Each structure stands twice: as structure tokens, then as C-alpha cells.
Amino acid sequence: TEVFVFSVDNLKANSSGAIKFGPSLSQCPALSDGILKSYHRYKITSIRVEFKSHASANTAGAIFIELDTACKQSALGSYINSFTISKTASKTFRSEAINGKEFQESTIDQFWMLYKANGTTTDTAGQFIITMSVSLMTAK
Amino acid sequence: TEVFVFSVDNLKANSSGAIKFGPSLSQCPALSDGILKSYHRYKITSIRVEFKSHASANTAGAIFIELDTACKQSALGSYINSFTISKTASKTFRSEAINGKEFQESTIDQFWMLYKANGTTTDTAGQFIITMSVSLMTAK
Amino acid sequence: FRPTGGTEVFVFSVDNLKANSSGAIKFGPSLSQCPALSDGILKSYHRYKITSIRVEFKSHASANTAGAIFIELDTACKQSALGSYINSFTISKTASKTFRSEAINGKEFQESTIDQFWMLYKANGTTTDTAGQFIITMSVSLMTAK
Amino acid sequence: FRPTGGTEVFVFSVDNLKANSSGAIKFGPSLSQCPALSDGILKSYHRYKITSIRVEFKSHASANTAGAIFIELDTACKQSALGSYINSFTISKTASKTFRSEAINGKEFQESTIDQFWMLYKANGTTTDTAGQFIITMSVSLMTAK
Amino acid sequence: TEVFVFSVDNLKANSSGAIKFGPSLSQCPALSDGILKSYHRYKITSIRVEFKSHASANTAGAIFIELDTACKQSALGSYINSFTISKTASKTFRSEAINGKEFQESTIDQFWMLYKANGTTTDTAGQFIITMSVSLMTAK
Amino acid sequence: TEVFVFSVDNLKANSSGAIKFGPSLSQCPALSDGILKSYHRYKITSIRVEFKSHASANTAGAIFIELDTACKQSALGSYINSFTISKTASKTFRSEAINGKEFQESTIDQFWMLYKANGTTTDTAGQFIITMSVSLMTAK
């Protein structure tokens, strides 16, 4: 069981995307092109996503976070979880939320974290600092 | 975790069908068009199906129940579980039978409950009173 | 399942039994009502014997259906029509008949290619109304892996 | 075999294992080395899980054959070549490896149409001489009659 | 009831065959052209087959034993029972395994014992020393 | 602090080489292209090297092991530590032997493990199964 800290950078005020955890998690090559190449099964036990807000106080908007444990949803949809663009905050997601109770093979993803900024301008918003706890088993 | 009680009504003596639990479970809109719209992950922990038998004593036949956790079987096939049309009874199904050990997303079904009455006439048989226990996860 | 063989219990059902249904339930490799024995464990053993069977009539019928379905054991595996009328389930009642080893030719092993016995049944009813179903519980013993 | 399901133990063998043999033993409905599971009891149940397996290498080889056959679990049911070389039986020695439920994806039931895991093996030997055989002892649990 | 001890000789490292017990059991003429000519009914109660392993330690392989009480199987098929070519061992088979519960006429066989060596070379493997217990009935 | 198990494979009877622990430790990408990309400082606390001996009994020779905490020695030199090619064995090396008392940066190696088989033929000898215990510091 290890802990990885990585960052989603250059996050504008109209940035939308998906952070696809697993072997397609290119923002942390220590997991993607790293330790998942040396194990069969893994599970991500909990993640702690932090918005750091490198923005001016006049930028309006709130970036939205939504968990997709189907690994297929493209557009966001839900607007309950939100970081305000002008404030640092952090959201912590446990195992049953992120499909983290059972191991799965290192070839398939576990969940996606979709985000949508929903601001008007392309001004800078900040970055995510994501701290995930993975468990591994059956070396390869 | 909450408990829903719904009914499958107007059940004739030759009625066959599938009660598709999950988002396509139209017999309980409090789950289908309801609380599953406000959560990502769910599991149905146990169901208690009851046959109520609003039938005369001269109606012959026995309605058959079969669990499909593949969510694809159309015709019934198995004839072990059965309610007699002229008698009230109840069958209780736990978690490992109904694929209820793990959470899954609110977009996909969990299991189906197929039923086939296998009587001759179109006379009234009764109704199902189904009591399901669901557990909900990450909100949406 | 040890390779020398084992003893297990199968529960299967003969379904959709009308009030004029007649037939034979041919136990062994031609016992299509339990594929776990027919297309199943008999493909993985040479010799078998069915030690005892417990046939149950479940009677999914109305009280106005007259008749009585008759049961007859054929350990020759060749009789087509019924003939004997001693053993009977009433169509409107649940009952069960249990048959031990010497009745069903179940004392000795035989190869998994040949049947052991047949269970003939004949409804003896006028209408094609529903009668019920059989729930059959057989105890098999297996010998020599294949 | 209750219609709600049961737990049984199957013993089968992977035979004629040379000193350069590689392959995959695909557990589930495609597990042709045990027809009692493949064309057998999985035809009479919806859901199953293989709780634990005990693979044994029996080493019908001379003492001059060099090499070590390698074992690797694939619970994705898609890996073709071996890759990992940690688990190994020496070709000239009898041994056994036992794999529990969380290693072989054996915690949850799944439908009898899909496989559960594969066991890949690769001899890692020069010649085509005889190495031995696997004697595999798996414990399955069954759920929902079909 | 008497006991016969006979031998299957000159057993190479790729030898396969069937030892057909009964009147066609040519490896023991005391049963084949012997006491079965003087009785109608017989049964072989138990057999004890022994592999004696007149082989060098460098011969690889294992000869396989399989009982055929149908008296028709030609190729081997099963690989559970085995003698290692470089070791002496013995397997004992009781009555229900070898179809030895009931008498049968002296004109028909009772069972076959198939063996297949499954080694590469034609080097010497050993011999079988088989000890069978027969029971005889009505004289002839 | 985590434990890595990796293997040095395809080890012939005349194989010589160096297993260079640290960022150049290509036999375990979970350390090399893995967790060392996500931390500044590391130390390998102890290693347990095991020779597994996939060899025939007629292969002569003994593979030799020598620790180089200078990370510069090319040829072997010392012949005290040895695995016999025809036997499984294991050698365990603690912290002061492998330069494992102090942290160092993830860009530089810690020690090398040189091995030289010193047999005549190119026949198969076996493999190493190496179990190392690393400690990680400041994240990166």
C-alpha cells in the first residue's frame, strides 16, 4: 500500500475534463507507467483532491467535481460538489464512493473524476493537488 | 439505507413478465424517478416478495419466480420457486442471491425478477407486495 | 469430487404437467430434466448408480380437476405405455413417493453411457388443465474418473 | 445439490506437459480440462465462484531435464504471454502452490457464462522432453438453479 | 476362491496397451486357458498391480493405469493414476472399481486395465506384477 | 516504507553482471520508473536475495555475489559469498552492508550487487528472487 501525490495543472476558468484513474492516469506516471506495470491487481482506497486557487479575487465561477465509477460519462451533469475558483478547498472521497472496496486488474480503470469550471473567461483558476492511497497485490 | 415497499398489481392467472430492479424499476418511482436521481452508487441489500392471492379457490396454477442477475434473460426457464395462485405466501431473497454485495452505478440495473403464472385462464391471481432494502452512496 | 468417485444429491423438476400428461423420465445420460447429471457429472465419471429417488407431486391445480397421475418404475428401460395403476398421486393434492435402491435397480454401478431405469407417468385426466409438477430428489454415487 | 446452490470440490489434471509447454488454463465455462464443471454443473446454475485452487506439479521427468515451469494468475481473462517469473515449479521436483480467494478473484459470485481467471504457465525449458502434469483441486460455490 | 500372480513383462518407456482380464487374459494362462475352462461363472474380487521399475534413474516418464469395465475403450484418456517409471509402487483395486461384485460367465471379460507409458524413448521401464483374487462358481 | 519483490531472470551458468539498485534498477520498474519518481529521498533498508536453481544436477559451478556500495566496480573480484548452481539458497544483507543507514536522493544509486557464475557451459542455472525493503522521504 502506497500514497501518491500528483497535480492537475494549468487549470483555467473554463476548463473541463476527466481525470481517469488507473492505467490511463497520465497525471501521475508513477502509477500509470510505473507501479501498475509491476502488479496485477490494485485498488485506490481513498483520494483527497485539493483545489489551490491561483486566481485573482475578481474571477467568478466554481469548478465542479463528479465521480464516475462507470468510466464512461463524458459531460458533467451534477453540480452539488464545487470548489469556488477564488478559494482553496479540499474534498476527500472514501472507498465506497470511488469504487475502492475490491481489487481489479491493472489494465482497467477504476473511476473518473470529471470537472467543469463553468466560468466565462479563460483566466487562471488554480490547480488540483490530488493525494491517492493505492493498495497492490499479485506482482507481475 | 432505506426501505421501499411497492406493488406489482393486476396480476392475472397467465401473467408473465420481468420486474427489472434499478433505474428501470417503474413499479416504484420513489427509487426509479426518485432517490436514484440523487446518488451515484446503490445496492439493493435484500428483497421480500409477497404474493397476496386475490383469487377464487377454483383457479389452478402457480406463478413462478426466477432471479436474473445478468439483466438479460427474457423467458423464465426454471420452475423451482413458486407461489400457488390460491394462497398467500412470501419469498425472501438475501444479498448474494440478488447481486447485492457490491455497489453499482445508478444508471445500470442490478437484477431482474422474472415471473410466469402458467395457468390457463385470464382470471385474477393477485398481486406482489415487494419490500426492498437499498443502500445509497456518493450523492449527485 | 475425488477421482475415485463421490456421492451427491441432485434436485430437479419435471414441469408444466397437465391433467392428461403421460411420459417417461429416463434416468441416466438421457435424463434431460437435470443437465447437471446428463450433460454434467456423468461426463466426468465412468460408473454410476442412483441410490434412491424421492419424487414429489406439487399439485398446482384447482380443486375441481379430477384425475390421478400414475407412476411406474421400468428398470428394463424399454416399456412405453404405463400398464400398472397401483402408485398414484391425486392431481389435487401434494404428495411424495420415495423409492429405494432395489426398486430402482440401484444396488450395482453401471456405465455412464447406459440408463438405469425409467419412471413412467400417466395423468389419467380428461381435460388439458394444469396438474402440477414433480420435484425429484435423487442420490447418485460415482465411481472411476473420466 | 439444493436449488439455492451448493459448494463442491473438483479434482482435474492438466496432462502431457512437456519441458517447453506454455498455455493458459481458463477457469470457468471454458475450463475444458474438467468437463464436470465446464459441460457439467455450470449448466445447472446461474452464479458461481471458485473459492480456492490448489495446483500441484507432479514431475514425471528425468533428473537431467533443466527448466522451471512458471505460473501466473490472470483475473482479467485477457493476458496471452506470461510476463512474470516469481512463481515457479522446478521441472524435476513435485511441488504444490495454493491460491486463496482474493488472489483468484474468488470473493464474489459471477454468472456461469463468463470466466473467472486464467492460470498461465510457461515451461522455460530447451527440449521437448516430458516434464509432468498438474493436479488441480478447486473449490467452487454455486448460487441460483438453472 | 483362488489367487493368481502373473506378470506383464518387457515394459518399455513408451509402451501402451490393455490387460484384458477374463478369458482373454493371455498373461496368465492358468486363468485364461486354465481354471476358467472348468467353471461356468467367475468374478475377480480384487487386483493388486505392482510396477517394479527395472529402469535407470535418467529415464523420464510415468506409466498411467485406467480401468475399463465396459471392455471396449481403446485409447487411455485419464491421467490420474500413475506409476513413475523410475520408482517401484503398487496400486490396489477393490471389487466395485473392477466390476467385481457379481459373477459372470467365463466366456466374457470383466474389465480391462489400460496403460500408457508417455515417455519419449524406447528404454526399459519395468514390469507389472499383478495379484488377482478370483472366485469360481458352477463347475463345467 | 514498502517492500518490493522482483526477479533477475534467465540466469545461465556463465552469467555475470551487476544489479544496480536505485533509479537504474531496471529489474523492478515499480522502484525505478515508479515510486522513486514520486519522492526525493530514499534508502534501501535490507535486501534478501534468493537463488532458485532451475538447473540439472550435472551442472557444475557456483554463482558469486559481491556488494559494491561505491557504484563503480565492474569485474567481480571476491569469491566468499556463493550460491551453488544446483541448490536453492538465500543470502540476506542488512543496512550497514548495503549502505542503507542514511537517505540519499532518488537520482543516485545506492549500491550494486555484482554476480559471476563461473561455470563452463551456457546451461540454465536459475533465477534470483530479490526482496528489498525501501524507506521513502519528502514527496515530489
Numbering used by the authors:
A (entry chain A), B (entry chain B), E (entry chain B), F (entry chain B): 61 to 200
C (entry chain C), D (entry chain C): 55 to 200
Publication text:
The Luteoviridae are an important family of pathogenic viruses responsible for necrosis of the plant vasculature which, in turn, causes severe stunting and dwarfism, and ultimately crop loss. The structures for BYDV and PLRV each reveal a luteovirid capsid composed of 180 CP monomers. The CP monomers each contain a single canonical jellyroll fold, and are arranged with T = 3 icosahedral quasi-symmetry to give a particle with a diameter of ∼30 nm. The luteovirid capsids are formed from CP subunits with a canonical jellyroll fold comprising two opposing β sheets, each containing 4 antiparallel β strands (βB-βI).
We therefore present high-resolution structures for VLPs of BYDV and PLRV at 3.0-Å and 3.4-Å resolution, respectively. BYDV and PLRV CPs assembled into monodisperse, homogeneous particles of the anticipated diameter. When imaged in ice, both BYDV and PLRV VLPs were monodisperse, so cryo-EM datasets were collected for each (see STAR Methods). Structure refinement was carried out with icosahedral symmetry imposed, yielding density maps at a resolution of 3.0 Å for BYDV and 3.4 Å for PLRV. Density maps for each structure were of sufficient quality and resolution to allow for unambiguous building of the shell (S) domain of the CP (BYDV: residues 61–200∗; PLRV: residues 68–208). In both cases the N-terminal R (RNA-binding) domain is not resolved in the cryo-EM density, except in the “C” conformer of BYDV, where an additional six residues of the R domain (residues 55–60) are visible. No density for such metal ions is seen in either BYDV or PLRV, and no putative metal binding sites were identified using bioinformatics. As for many viruses, both capsid structures are strongly positively charged on their inner surfaces, presumably to help facilitate packaging of the polyanionic RNA genome. The outer surface charge profile is similar in both BYDV and PLRV capsid structures, with an acidic patch at the center of each asymmetric trimer. Inspection of the interfaces between individual CP protomers, and between asymmetric units, in BYDV and PLRV suggest that both viruses have a similar volume of solvent hidden surface involved in supramolecular assembly. BYDV and PLRV have comparatively short insertions at the C-D, E-F, and G-H loops, where larger insertions are found in all other viruses with known structures, resulting in a much more compact fold.
